[PDB]
Design a binder for this molecule. Structure first.
Ligand code: EMC
Ligand code: EMC
Lengths: 103, 92, 52
C-alpha cells in the first residue's frame, strides 16, 4: 500500500507536469496570436483613417494608389487574422489528449 | 544501550540530513521556476516593444505607396519613426 | 526629411526606392527578431514542466 501511494504519485506527477507545459505552450501561442493582430489592427487603423481623410473630396491622383493600398493592408490583415485563429484553434486542440489521460 | 545509544539517534540524524536536503532542493527548484519565468517575461515584453516599431515602420511603408514624397502623412510618419526609435533606445 | 524640404525632382525617384528598401528591409528584419524571441520563450516550456 506504499507502492499504491507511489505508482500514482509517479503518474499524476508526470501528467500534471505535462499539463503545465501544455498550459504554458498555449499562453505563448495566445500572446503571439493576439500580438500579431494588435500589430496589424494598428497599422490598419492609420491607413483606413488616412483613406477616410484623403478622400473627403475625391483625390484623382492618389485614387489608384489608395485602392491598391486598401487592398494590400486589407488582404494582409485578412490573412494574418486567419492564421491567428488557426494557431489558437490548434492550441485548444492540444489539451484534448491530456484532458483524457487526466480522467 | 547500543540501539538507543548510537543507532536510533543516527537514523534521526539522516532523517534530518534528508529533510534538510529536501528543503534546499525544493528551494533550488523555486528559484529555477522564478528564473525561467523572468526570462520568458523579458522575451515577450521585448517582442512587443519591437512590435511598436514594426507597426510604425509598416505604416510609413504604405504611406510611401501614395507616391507623394511630399505628403504630410509620409513626412510625419517618417518623423515619428525617428521618435519611436529614440524612445526605444532610452527605456530599452 | 532634409533633402525634400522643397521637392527635389531629380532625387525623387531614388528617394522613393530607397524609402522602400530600408523600410521593407527593417520590416522583415524586425519580424524575424520577434519570431526568434518568441521561439526562445517557447523553449523553457518543456523544462518548466519537468521542474514541477
Ligand atoms: C482598422 C480595423 Hg482592426
Ligand atoms: C541610434 C539613435 Hg535612434
Amino acid at each position: 500500500l506504499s507502492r499504491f501511494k507511489q505508482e500514482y504519485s509517479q503518474a499524476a506527477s508526470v501528467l500534471v507536469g505535462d499539463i503545465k507545459t501544455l498550459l504554458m505552450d498555449s499562453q505563448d501561442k495566445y500572446f503571439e496570436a493576439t500580438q500579431t493582430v494588435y500589430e496589424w489592427c494598428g497599422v490598419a487603423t492609420q491607413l483606413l483613417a488616412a483613406y477616410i481623410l484623403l478622400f473627403d473630396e475625391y483625390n484623382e491622383k492618389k485614387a489608384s494608389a489608395q485602392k491598391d493600398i486598401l487592398i494590400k493592408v486589407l488582404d494582409d490583415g485578412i490573412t494574418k487574422l486567419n492564421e491567428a485563429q488557426k494557431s489558437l484553434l490548434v492550441s485548444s486542440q492540444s489539451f484534448n489528449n491530456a484532458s483524457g489521460k487526466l480522467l | 544501550g547500543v540501539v538507543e545509544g548510537k543507532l536510533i539517534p543516527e537514523l534521526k540524524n539522516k532523517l534530518k540530513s534528508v529533510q534538510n536536503f529536501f528543503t534546499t532542493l525544493s528551494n533550488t527548484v523555486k528559484q529555477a521556476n522564478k528564473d525561467i519565468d523572468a526570462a520568458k517575461l523579458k522575451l515577450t515584453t521585448e517582442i512587443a516593444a519591437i512590435g511598436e516599431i514594426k507597426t510604425e515602420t509598416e505604416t510609413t511603408r504604405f504611406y510611401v505607396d501614395y507616391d507623394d514624397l511630399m505628403l504630410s502623412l509620409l513626412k510625419e510618419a517618417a518623423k515619428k519613426m525617428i521618435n519611436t526609435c529614440n524612445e526605444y533606445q532610452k527605456r530599452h
